Amino acid sequence: KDWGDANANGYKERRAVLMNGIPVVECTEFPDAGTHPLGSAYTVTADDAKCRMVT
Amino acid sequence: EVYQNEVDTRFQYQAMFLGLSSQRSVADRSNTYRIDRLNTSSVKGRTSGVALEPTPVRNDKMLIVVDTVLYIRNPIDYQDDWTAPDFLTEMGQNNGSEFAEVFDQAHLIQLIKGRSWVAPAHLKPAFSDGIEIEATIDSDVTTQAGMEANAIAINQAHKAGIDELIKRKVPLNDMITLVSTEIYSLLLEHPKLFNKDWGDANANGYKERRAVLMNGIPVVECTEFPDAGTHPLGSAYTVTADDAKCRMVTFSKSRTLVTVEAKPFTSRIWDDEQNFANVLDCYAMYQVGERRPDTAAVVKFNEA
Amino acid sequence: EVYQNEVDTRFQYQAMFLGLSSQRSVADRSNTYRIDRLNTSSVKGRTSGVALEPTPVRNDKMLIVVDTVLYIRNPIDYQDDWTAPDFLTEMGQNNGSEFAEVFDQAHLIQLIKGRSWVAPAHLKPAFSDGIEIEATIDSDVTTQAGMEANAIAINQAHKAGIDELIKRKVPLNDMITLVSTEIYSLLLEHPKLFNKDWGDANANGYKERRAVLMNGIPVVECTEFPDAGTHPLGSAYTVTADDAKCRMVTFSKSRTLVTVEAKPFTSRIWDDEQNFANVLDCYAMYQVGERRPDTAAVVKFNEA
């Protein structure tokens, strides 16, 4: 859109885009390396770090 | 009771058509309602010495029957605690959202199917056929020239529908146009936003994206448009491929839709020893009727 | 009972001419109104006492009689209850809308028919002849060339009408233009003519599609406009082929028309023993008159 929208989902996130009918929110807290502090279940692989969009 | 309140209040916050239709109720136990299609209300003049002729009855009133009950089934085992909080409340919200979505879906299917009405004899002077305005919008277009070419086509279709519907003596004060998400996105700027007055009076629960006022009437974005081939309520609501292409409808908020609530939303809990579960279900019976189909305008888009 | 209230409140809401013409009433049980046109000049200047002022006998008057009675006949069968089943009210708005449509239709009929008016009997210089404007709008085909050509024709016809009225000493403050639906639709496709001074985006207090400022005066679209060739008020309101072609009318809200209501809206219940249908009918006595046909502009569009 010309401005996207004005109703941001997050209190500070760069939200309010609504491209394909639903809001799209920018996520700064995004994983890159496989050392998450929860165990081996949350370890990230090389391919798991290439997926940068979730719906 | 807590579960019943949660499912009920969700209607006031998401169900759009609770205020866009005549909320009638079937008082009789026959579960049938009679819609009076008034078609003999002409004005004549007794010029003294003239002799008048008797006025025949020419009202082809229609019948709507609540032959379907809508229900939701939630089997719950004994070990699980259904009465525990944070579960019924979460259950109530989802059930209410689904029920209101099906309500709006049924209403839109009714208007879409009421596009090729024939308006038979005994009604022709006061009743007309449906609206079949066509459009050719190419959604798959990224060029700025093509982007405005779709907007002008949509605006032209809306103008034609509004002109035709006004020609049939329908006040502009009572008009709402419903658009799909993709059509609403394809709309032009028209930044006139109806924050709390998109044809709804004393409404606070509803939260919609009616931020556009096309051609002097509110236009509201409806996310619940039919695109499949079936619908739970009844078997005459099976949306065809042609009926799925209609993505914008213009109708009247007081002369196009009537709803009958044969049974309100009641929650029932009953033990099931056979399968070892406490099945919880809430159900309600209702049916939507399209009185005066001539006051509804729809457009069938055709992507190039 | 409450049916009279329902048919009344709708009448005021829809009938735009309740404020566009003088409201009169025959309070003499004579079914006739003796209203006089005004032709008093400013022949003054006694000056010297020797010179004497001539005595004028220039007098004229008109009479309007309520010949026909306007009634609506509603056959109600014995089985259908009507005391207050939320149905007589619904029939109330329909009957009121029909009455308002007939009222506005009669007003437009008189406005169109008084466009010639010939000349008064004594040929008063104050009372000029009626105004008729010839225009040619190519409404049949608009291949992106006549769309703006027709709008120019409409604009120049409106300008000629406003100039002719201004020449006849009618203030710009009190003057409204009523236009047919098709001409209004052709007008909005070329919207640079409108002054874009909407503000309220409505009519002159009404709820019709109106360019509130065009050529200095509002241009309202009146759906109830003469198309047929027969009217309830009698043979004095029949329409010829030429009278139907006139699609736009300009006049003043305080001098052009006067309406008189001998009997208000009266509704009674009649138990028709024959046909087994007790009927409810509403009737009212009124008649309209073009007091000042000179202060009215009528434009006729003759195909292409």
Add this chain to the structure above:
Amino acid sequence: EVYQNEVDTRFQYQAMFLGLSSQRSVADRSNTYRIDRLNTSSVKGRTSGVALEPTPVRNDKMLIVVDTVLYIRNPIDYQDDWTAPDFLTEMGQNNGSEFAEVFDQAHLIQLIKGRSWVAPAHLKPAFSDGIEIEATIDSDVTTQAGMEANAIAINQAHKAGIDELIKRKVPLNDMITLVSTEIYSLLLEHPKLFNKDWGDANANGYKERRAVLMNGIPVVECTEFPDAGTHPLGSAYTVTADDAKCRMVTFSKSRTLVTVEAKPFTSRIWDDEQNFANVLDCYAMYQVGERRPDTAAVVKFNEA
């Protein structure tokens, strides 16, 4: 009141179809009735086996609505006396006979209409369609030469019909055959009547024509038989030439016809002051329905 009782008591007599259909009544104010197409249910289910085997069976829900107000009108002059006995009773018997005649006529008309009824087998394959037994009956013929020529054709058509009904699990005892007056006349003085002449006349055949048994079922001549014309009930009972050619039909005691009587026999007196005559009329609203159109051994004859 005395007039009403005279018509009612006479109506019970001579009404053949008063006991050949389900006498239902629309209890609710709404004049609509819903009844199941198939009331047959094999409740005889063996529970010896531990695991039951329920059979999914569905029945169409018929909808019958009363619309016509059947009436008979008798104008009584001012000087003549209507309340005097020996005149109310004489008028009452004729009115009751006419009502019974139109009752039987309507039932036969709807049966002939149900002759060519296509079964929605996709809803249900158990419900078969209407049956169309055809035969040729000699009209003129001769003496002792053509009398048995048409008689054998009629009799073999009768076997065809009864065999078709037996194939549909219709008990032989619940089976009645109604024929036209001329068909009954041709049946007599024939070898078919000479061989099958068991005159039971227990209940139905006593008051009416004697029930001559042919194939274990009564055969009764109905005086009130359809001809090529119309019916007072409405356009749904209009008779065609092909429909009038049907002269014999067989059906079931209580699975073929159903009647709903929203308004019983009621009468009122009003003064038709225009014609100087008190008008006394009796009116009643009822609509006959026909369940299970398959169970109708209707036969059509043609030529000679």
